[PDB]
C-alpha cells in the first residue's frame, strides 16, 4: 500500500514530514517507502537481514543478468552467432539499441505520454533510470556483439555458446580493468588505495566475496557526484539544441529521450566533456534528487538522501561511531570533538542538533560529511567501507581477470590495453574521445584526442 497510503503498517515505512518543510506543507502527507524484503519472512528467531538479488562479483551481470531465465531472454537465440538480442523496433544511426521490456506498470511511458516509448530490458532492472545509464548499458551491449563478431571471423568453427561465453568473459574483464585501474584510485585516493587495495597476489578461496549490508548504503556516496542536468553535445562537442541542459527531474525514466532525441552519442559526449559535481560540506546533494526525484512518474517527488537514511534504519545499520570503531577510527562523543574530525564545526553543530550524539548519525550522512582524502572523493570512513568491499570482490573472485588460469599471459597483455574511451570509439559515431584517464579528463579540447591515437583490443591471443 506504500505508493499511496501514509499509514505505517508493514511493509510500509513512510518518511514523516517535518514542520516548515521547504516543499511539503501538508504534514498529513509523507514520502513513500517500502521496507526491503526480509531474507527470512515472518521470523522471530533471526535478526532481520536483507537480500542482494544480483551477483556480488564485477562480472558485468548488469549486461548478462544474475538469473538463468533473464540471461536466456537477453541473448539472440535465433542463430549460432553468440550475440545479445537488440531492439527490433528502433536503432541509433544504424547502431544497436537495448530491447524494450514488457512491464505491467511501465514508468517510461509516463515521462512522455504521446511518445509511447517503454523501458529497456538489460542484465539489470534499473537500465532506464537515467539516459546516461542506458547509454553505458547500450555501449556495453554493442561491445559484446562487437567482440563476438570479431571472434567468429577469427574462429568460425566456434558455436553460439563459445561466442557468447568468450565475449562475456572479455566484457567481464573490461569492467574489472576500468574499475580497479581507473575508477577506484580516483574514489579512494593513493593512501587508501595502498591500504585497502595492495597489489593483487592471487585468488584466496577464504575471502568472503559477499556484499556487506553497509556497502549498499556507503556506496550511495555517488549521490554527491550527481549534476542537476543531462548535458548533451553535438558532433563538434557543442551544446546540442533543442534541450542541451535538461533538468534531471525530466530525464528519470525518459527512455524516449534516447530513442526520439538522438540516441547514445550526445549523452556520452556530455558525460566525457562535463565535470562531475564536487562534494562540499555546504553543497552535499542537488534538489533534482533531494526534491524532484521521480516527479514525472510518481504521486510526489522523492528525496534520495532522506531515502538513503531511512534505508539504513530499515536495514538495521549501526550509527557513525560504531562504523568508525569498526574501521579503527576515533569516535567523537562531543560537538567540539566532532568538529575536529570533520575539520568543520559549522557542520558538526548542525549534525549534533539533529542526532544529539555522533553515535546516532546515519551512516550515509556521516560518511558524506567527512572531508575528502588527498586525490580522492571519499572521507576516511567511506574509504574504509568502500576499500574493504572492493578488496573482497577482487581477492575472493575465482574468475578475476588477473587470476592464473582465467586468461593466458598474452590474453592478459592484450586486455591491459583496453580503455573506456576506446570502447566509445568501437561502438558509436564518436571520433573524439577523452584522453586517458577518462574519469579525470573533463575539458574539451584540452583533455581530448582522436580515435586513431588509441590502440584497439588485439584479439590475436583468442585464435584457436
Amino acid at each position: 500500500n506504500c505508493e499511496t497510503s501514509c499509514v505505517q503498517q508493514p511493509p510500509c515505512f513512510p518518511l514523516k514530514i517535518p514542520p516548515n518543510d521547504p516543499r511539503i506543507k501538508n504534514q498529513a502527507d509523507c514520502i513513500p517507502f517500502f521496507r526491503s524484503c526480509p531474507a527470512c519472512p515472518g521470523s522471530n528467531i533471526t535478526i532481520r537481514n536483507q537480500i542482494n538479488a544480483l551477483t556480488s562479483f564485477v562480472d558485468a551481470s548488469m549486461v548478462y543478468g544474475s538469473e538463468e531465465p533473464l540471461a536466456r531472454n537477453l541473448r539472440n537465440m535465433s542463430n549460432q552467432l553468440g550475440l545479445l538480442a537488440v531492439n527490433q523496433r528502433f536503432q541509433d544511426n544504424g547502431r544497436a539499441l537495448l530491447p524494450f521490456d514488457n512491464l505491467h506498470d511501465d514508468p517510461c511511458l509516463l515521462t512522455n505520454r504521446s511518445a509511447r516509448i517503454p523501458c529497456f530490458l538489460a542484465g539489470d532492472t534499473r537500465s532506464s533510470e537515467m539516459p546516461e545509464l542506458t547509454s553505458m548499458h547500450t555501449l556495453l551491449l554493442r561491445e559484446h556483439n562487437r567482440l563476438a563478431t570479431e571472434l567468429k571471423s577469427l574462429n568460425p568453427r566456434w558455436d553460439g555458446e563459445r561466442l557468447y561465453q568468450e565475449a562475456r568473459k572479455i566484457v567481464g574483464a573490461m569492467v574489472q580493468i576500468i574499475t580497479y585501474r581507473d575508477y577506484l584510485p580516483l574514489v579512494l585516493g593513493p593512501t587508501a588505495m595502498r591500504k585497502y587495495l595492495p597489489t593483487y597476489r592471487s585468488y584466496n578461496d577464504s575471502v568472503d566475496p559477499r556484499i556487506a549490508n553497509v556497502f549498499t548504503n556507503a556506496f550511495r556516496y555517488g549521490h554527491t557526484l550527481i549534476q542537476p542536468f543531462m548535458f548533451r553535445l553535438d558532433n563538434r562537442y557543442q551544446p546540442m539544441e533543442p534541450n542541451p541542459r535538461v533538468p534531471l527531474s525530466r530525464v528519470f525514466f525518459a527512455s524516449w529521450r534516447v530513442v526520439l532525441e538522438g540516441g547514445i552519442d550526445p549523452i556520452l559526449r556530455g558525460l566525457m566533456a562535463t565535470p562531475a559535481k564536487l562534494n562540499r560540506q555546504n553543497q552535499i546533494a542537488v534538489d533534482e534528487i533531494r526534491e524532484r526525484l521521480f516527479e514525472q512518474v510518481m504521486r510526489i517527488g522523492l528525496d534520495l538522501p532522506a531515502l538513503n537514511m531511512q534505508r539504513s534504519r530499515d536495514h538495521g545499520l549501526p550509527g557513525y561511531n560504531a562504523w568508525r570503531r569498526f574501521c579503527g577510527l576515533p569516535q567523537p562523543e562531543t560537538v567540539g570533538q566532532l568538529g575536529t574530525v570533520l575539520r568543520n564545526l559549522k557542520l558538526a553543530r548542525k549534525l549534533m542538533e539533529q542526532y544529539g550524539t555522533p553515535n546516532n548519525i546515519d551512516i550515509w550522512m556521516g560518511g558524506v560529511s567527512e572531508p575528502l582524502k588527498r586525490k580522492g572523493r571519499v572521507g576516511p570512513l567511506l574509504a574504509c567501507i568502500i576499500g574493504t568491499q572492493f578488496r573482497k570482490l577482487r581477492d575472493g573472485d575465482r574468475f578475476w581477470w588477473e587470476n592464473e588460469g582465467v586468461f593466458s599471459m598474452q590474453q592478459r597483455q592484450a586486455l591491459a590495453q583496453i580503455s573506456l574511451p576506446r570502447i566509445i570509439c568501437d561502438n558509436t559515431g564518436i571520433t573524439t574521445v577523452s584522453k586517458n584517464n577518462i574519469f579525470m579528463s573533463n575539458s574539451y579540447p584540452r583533455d581530448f584526442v582522436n580515435c586513431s591515437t588509441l590502440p584497439a583490443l588485439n584479439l590475436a591471443s583468442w585464435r584457436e
Binding site: 517535518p18 549534476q227 562531475a276
Partner: protein, 103 residues
C-alpha cells in the same frame, strides 16, 4: 558443482567451491556488525514514537535532508579533476554488485 570450468555461472553459484552460494544472486547480505533494531530483531529505529536511540530522539530523515543536505542549485561547485563519466561508472558499477529487492 563442476571440478573443471572455463566460465562464470549467471547466478554466481560455484565461484567459491567450499561455500558455493557466496557471491551468488538472491541471497542474504553479509553483516560486518550486528543489526541495531528498535525491538532488537525487526523494527527500525524511528518506527515507534518516543522510542529513543542510544539516549536521544530519532531525527526524521527528511529533517536531516532539509538541514544538512540542502543547498542552492546555482551555488554548485564543479569538480575540477573529475568528469560526469566518474558519477556514472559508479552507478553502472553499483548495478553489477548490489540490488536490494522490496515488495
Amino acid at each position: 558443482c563442476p571440478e573443471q570450468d572455463k566460465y562464470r555461472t549467471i547466478t554466481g553459484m560455484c565461484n567459491n567451491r567450499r561455500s558455493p552460494t557466496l557471491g551468488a544472486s538472491n541471497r542474504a547480505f553479509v553483516r560486518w556488525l550486528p543489526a541495531e533494531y528498535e525491538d532488537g530483531f525487526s523494527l527500525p529505529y524511528g518506527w515507534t514514537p518516543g522510542v529513543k536511540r542510544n539516549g536521544f530522539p530519532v531525527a526524521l530523515a527528511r529533517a536531516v535532508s532539509n538541514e544538512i543536505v540542502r543547498f542552492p542549485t546555482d551555488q554548485l561547485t564543479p569538480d575540477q579533476e573529475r568528469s560526469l563519466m566518474f558519477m556514472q561508472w559508479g552507478q553502472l558499477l553499483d548495478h553489477d554488485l548490489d540490488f536490494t529487492p522490496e515488495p
